[PDB]
Design a protein around this nucleic acid. Sequence first.
DNA 1: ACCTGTGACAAATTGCCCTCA
DNA 2: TCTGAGGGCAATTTGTCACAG
DNA 3: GACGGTAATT
DNA 4: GTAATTACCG
Length: 212
Amino acid sequence: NSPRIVQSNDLTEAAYSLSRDQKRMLYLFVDQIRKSHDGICEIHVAKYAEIFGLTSAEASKDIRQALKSFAGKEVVFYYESFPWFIKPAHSPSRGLYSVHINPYLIPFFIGRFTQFRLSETKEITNPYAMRLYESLCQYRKPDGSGIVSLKIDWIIERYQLPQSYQRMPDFRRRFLQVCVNEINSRTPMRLSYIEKKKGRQTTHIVFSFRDI
DNA sequence: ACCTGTGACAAATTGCCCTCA
DNA sequence: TCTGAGGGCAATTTGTCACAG
DNA sequence: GACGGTAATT
DNA sequence: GTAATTACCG
Ligand SMILES: [Mg+2]
Ligand SMILES: [Mg+2]
């Protein structure tokens, strides 16, 4: 049974922009941190490859490029911004990377919490769909169902959606429908929604879900 | 002016393949 | 030989915007 | 490369 | 023929 990720709701609702590969690595960091400290973590290429059904080569490519793409990335808890890394990653041994997570991030990870097993999200491709599945997990009930109304502006400012998704039809076509379809095809969740409006503008999205 | 969706194009990402220390 | 660090790809997805209703 | 199987050399 | 350590090859 795959690793049970838990995280403070403050991270689920933080403002940041990470790729799929970066979020994948981040889940393992959160797992390492929680089992305890000082903040120094490690990643093995071959274990990553086995976890996500990747080759060693493509695993190596994903880790390396995610890792160099962390530089300058920042995290906002609503309104405080932090860098993810305080030192570049580096490899003491072949197939092994050592990373220095900002120790000031530790209390935001382990605290009003969100939890999901890693197999639920490891087939998801779109990172915004990972964000959506995390925010839905934050409201899930023991039995596996839930319902929540999210404000569109808050979705855009938390997930840092790109500017053209401020136009609602592109928001619908390239984010909402794709990430709902992905969740429904790639997780053990079954998700539906309906739109809440005010005048001509759509202001919130109401998600209902149950477990299969 | 506001809303919706679709058609196109560009930019990014994906799972691939190959090569050599 | 088995790893993994590189070097590439075509097909597909994602981000953007012009245009009609 | 890094590691271990296998022949080779004392 | 054996023993055992070793260069090196895959
Ligand atoms: Mg990859
Ligand atoms: Mg999709």
